[PDB]
Enzyme design. Structure first.
Site, PDB file in Angstrom:
ATOM      1  N   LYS A 156       0.827  -1.202   0.000  1.00  8.79           N
ATOM      2  CA  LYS A 156       0.000   0.000   0.000  1.00  8.79           C
ATOM      3  C   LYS A 156       0.861   1.251   0.000  1.00  8.79           C
ATOM      4  O   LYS A 156       0.423   2.319  -0.434  1.00  8.79           O
ATOM      5  CB  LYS A 156      -0.935  -0.006   1.208  1.00  8.79           C
TER       6      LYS A 156
ATOM      7  N   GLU B 206       9.579   1.443   8.849  1.00  6.61           N
ATOM      8  CA  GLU B 206       9.578   0.710   7.594  1.00  6.61           C
ATOM      9  C   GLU B 206      10.854  -0.109   7.470  1.00  6.61           C
ATOM     10  O   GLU B 206      11.883   0.214   8.069  1.00  6.61           O
ATOM     11  CB  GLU B 206       9.444   1.667   6.406  1.00  6.61           C
ATOM     12  N   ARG B 207      10.772  -1.192   6.702  1.00  3.38           N
ATOM     13  CA  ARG B 207      11.953  -1.996   6.425  1.00  3.38           C
ATOM     14  C   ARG B 207      12.981  -1.156   5.682  1.00  3.38           C
ATOM     15  O   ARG B 207      12.652  -0.445   4.730  1.00  3.38           O
ATOM     16  CB  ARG B 207      11.580  -3.230   5.607  1.00  3.38           C
TER      17      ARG B 207
END
Lengths: 166, 85, 167, 85, 237, 84
Positions: free
Chosen positions: E158, E184-185
């Site tokens: 998304k 976030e990664r």
């Protein structure tokens, strides 16, 4: 090893003080400064009892301990170091003062009220507990004879229950 | 024997007002404030379930009393006050 | 009831009540079940490897205000109360390098394969800030995990951090 | 979560105008609403909807926007009840 | 004037128990400061636990910290800069840019936590945003004044739709966008960086508008939590 | 005052208790007076080990057929039950 462990509860500080001072002579010398300190604290209703409050600041705690010690050399001995250590470690040691007194009694005085069926408030300041006990009891009975009232011997309750329950 | 009196009066003094003229009986000193909790030493006249002015512009409720500190839940953000106020 | 009791809780016990010379050495007050409290190391770096004098090393994850607690990375039977503890002053260092392969070393770097010692580029700190956002590009090089579905449907690329969750 | 509960409250409060529109103190009601567990947007929406039907005449709203911490929440229903009394 | 500082006494878990001096007890949520050999150690005070010791769960690695190191308060809450100067940069939770993009001096570096709009500052409206995707152009308008949520697990990406929405909106936005990379990664972080820079949204040298701030997911949890606070502060500014 | 009984908790035990309802330690509660004792042993005795133990070589009857011939209840059969 101390005479008997006081089972902690801020009595660790007092137990350690007794042990360290017992490395030295520091027996009457230790108890004397403590008695003077406790008397001084009693001698100031406030600022010495309200001084025994958690809200006192660390600077405030060190300063209050120093001011109590400022009563000349009434804070002589290792009691000064113990008071300063508690000033940051644990604020309240009036019970620790009583515990120091208890250790002093254990070192020298011993003795406590017997009880059994008597509510007397006497003392037997002697190491042995096989001779002086009877003399102390008879004296406290024949002298003073204060409010030692347990109301009645519990055996009255014992017999009443025993008969009342078959 | 003026030394004991001077020492006692100095000890009572130099304490701002916490033990000087107040004794935290009518006002209070906040030992700590967790989130809205306020373990307060002082306010020796506040009753249970008490609305209290925490002197940080934020009010709150004294909804429990304990041995040596009163836990007065605060009606405002935690940062809005500070420990010791 | 004039007040409350003398106290509520405590942090330290022993009764020297004097100056602190235990800035490099420690006192193992509480030690047991693979976790040991240590008295001493006034300003130790958090998570510093520390050596217990009996012969077992340790890392210090706990640095509580009174006493700092250090994990006893070994059989605890050797440790004892009051045993000296020496600060090794470093994060976990293990000699690992291109010569490491082909054997089995302990995660403490020591080569325990039994097939001789290990020569490596040197000991490196085992917990460091990983390569962040800057010095990396998107994983483009593939990795062929041999299994047909593995390479095909869910290909784990070269350099990536895939996981194989399962029962 | 809201199986019409917020909507049901809006409906019942608004329909009160059916009777409050007259002048009979026997049946005219001064309704109010407490705001436990609501984001400030929801309260804004309910206020707007009420004012749209012209319900800013005889309704009240105890406001506990979800911004407010635990004290405001656990005392807001009770203070609302006091206003109700 | 006087620099308030204390002695960071105890480090437990990822939390550093920052004691303090008389009147030096920092407030909760205030920005502390901890200078370390690795650089700046970011610790946010927690519940002020009495004994003049206010708890703190740090925004940086707990490693290396040495007991008793002095920590001086920043005099207020955690802060990141606010203004168009932030545009095109990857603002860290501590606030030290992790892209090595140099300090983009702004008008102010406001404290992260603040007041929300009053009910006299909270308004509401019915507006639709051009999301450029026929899915959101038809089946669900996006609100110019209202939250627009989303869902979908790993592999639905998304965030890709998020970047696309940012780009399309900015392509016809009179005001600057904003983002907040809550944990976030890191590889997804770099890929987002590349796609945002090359799309023209993040004009490395121009005047970009989509200031992406990432929590980086690889820190002790406090920074990750307060990152969204920082981003909300930025958008509020 | 707390008076030390000086003995581990022991129960008035023996064949005489037959038909008598006894309280926790063995205080009779029906109202029948004393019941004789063939020993007052501690409430937590150490059970017989391996050698002093044996198999279930002697059966018994559960009385109600009660799926009892199906699943017996023999010498020392530590059976359990359950219910609402």
């Amino acid at each position: 090893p101390p005479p008997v462990r006081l089972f902690g509860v801020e009595g660790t500080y007092a137990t350690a003080l007794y042990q360290a001072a017992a490395k030295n002579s520091s027996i009457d010398a230790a108890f004397q400064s403590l008695q003077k300190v406790e008397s001084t604290v009693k001698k100031n209703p406030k600022l010495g009892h309200l001084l025994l409050n958690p809200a006192l600041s660390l600077k405030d705690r060190n300063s209050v301990i120093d001011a109590i010690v400022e009563t000349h050399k009434n804070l002589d001995g290792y009691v000064v170091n113990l008071l300063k250590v508690l000033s940051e470690n644990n604020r309240l040691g009036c019970f620790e003062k009583i515990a120091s007194d208890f250790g002093v009694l254990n070192d020298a005085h011993n003795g406590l009220l017997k009880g059994t069926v008597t509510s007397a408030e006497p003392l037997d300041p002697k190491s042995f507990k096989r001779i002086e006990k009877a003399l102390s009891a008879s004296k406290l009975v024949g002298q003073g004879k204060s409010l030692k009232l347990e109301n009645v011997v519990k055996p009255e309750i014992k017999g009443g229950l025993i008969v009342e329950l078959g | 024997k003026a030394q004991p009196t001077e020492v006692s009066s100095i000890l009572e003094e130099r304490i701002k007002g916490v033990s000087d003229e107040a004794n935290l009986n009518e006002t209070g000193r906040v030992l700590a404030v967790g989130d809205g909790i306020a373990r307060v030493f002082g306010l020796n006249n506040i009753q249970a379930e008490e609305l209290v002015e925490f002197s940080s512009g934020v009010k709150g409720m004294a909804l429990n009393l304990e041995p040596g500190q009163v836990g007065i839940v605060l009606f405002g953000s935690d940062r809005l006050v500070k420990e010791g106020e | 009831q004039p007040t409350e009791v003398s106290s509520i809780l405590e942090e330290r016990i022993k009764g020297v009540s004097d100056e602190a010379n235990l800035n490099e050495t420690g006192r193992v007050l509480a030690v047991g079940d693979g976790i040991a409290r240590v008295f001493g190391l006034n300003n130790i770096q958090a998570e510093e490897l520390v050596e217990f004098s009996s012969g077992v090393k340790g890392m210090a994850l706990n640095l509580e205000p009174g006493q700092v607690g250090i994990v006893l990375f070994g059989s605890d039977r050797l440790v004892k109360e009051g045993e000296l503890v020496k600060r090794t002053g470093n994060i976990v260092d293990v000699p690992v390098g291109p010569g490491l392969l082909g054997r089995v070393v302990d995660a403490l770097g020591n080569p325990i394969d039994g097939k001789g010692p290990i020569d490596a580029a040197g000991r490196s700190r085992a917990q460091v800030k990983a390569p962040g956002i800057l010095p990396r590009r998107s994983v483009h090089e593939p990795v062929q995990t041999g299994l047909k579905a593995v390479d095909a449907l869910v290909p784990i690329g070269r350099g990536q951090r895939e996981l194989i969750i399962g029962d | 979560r809201q199986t019409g509960k917020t909507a049901v409250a809006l409906d019942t409060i608004l329909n009160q105008k059916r009777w409050n529109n007259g002048s009979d103190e026997s049946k005219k009601l001064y309704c109010v609403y407490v705001a436990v567990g609501q984001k400030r947007s929801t309260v804004a929406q309910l206020v707007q909807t009420l004012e749209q039907h012209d319900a800013m005449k005889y309704s009240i709203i105890v406001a506990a926007t979800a911004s407010e911490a635990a004290p405001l929440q656990y005392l807001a229903p009770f203070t609302a009840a006091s206003i109700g009394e | 004037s006087t620099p308030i500082t204390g002695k960071v006494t105890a480090v437990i878990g990822a939390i550093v128990d920052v004691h303090f001096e008389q009147s030096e007890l920092p407030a909760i949520l205030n920005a502390l400061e901890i200078k370390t050999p690795q650089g700046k150690l970011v610790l946010e005070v927690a519940q002020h636990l009495g004994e003049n010791t206010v708890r703190t769960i740090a925004m940086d690695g707990t490693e290396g910290l040495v007991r008793g190191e002095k920590v001086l308060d920043t005099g207020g809450p955690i802060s990141v800069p606010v203004g168009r100067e932030t545009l095109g940069r990857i603002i860290n939770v501590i606030g030290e840019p992790i892209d090595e993009r140099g300090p983009i001096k702004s008008k102010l570096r406001k404290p992260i936590h603040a007041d929300p709009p009053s009910f006299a500052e909270q308004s509401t409206s019915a507006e639709i945003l051009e999301t450029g995707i026929k899915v959101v152009d038809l089946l669900a308008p996006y609100a110019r004044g209202g939250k627009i949520g989303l869902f979908g697990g790993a592999g639905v990406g998304k965030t890709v739709f998020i970047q696309e929405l940012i780009n399309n909106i900015a392509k016809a936005h009179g005001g600057f966008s904003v983002f907040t990379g809550v944990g976030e990664r890191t590889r997804e972080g770099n890929d987002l960086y590349r796609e945002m820079k090359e799309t023209g949204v993040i004009n490395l040298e121009g005047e970009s508008k989509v200031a992406l701030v990432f929590g980086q997911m690889n820190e002790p949890p406090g920074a990750r939590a307060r990152v969204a606070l920082t981003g909300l502060t930025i958008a509020e500014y």
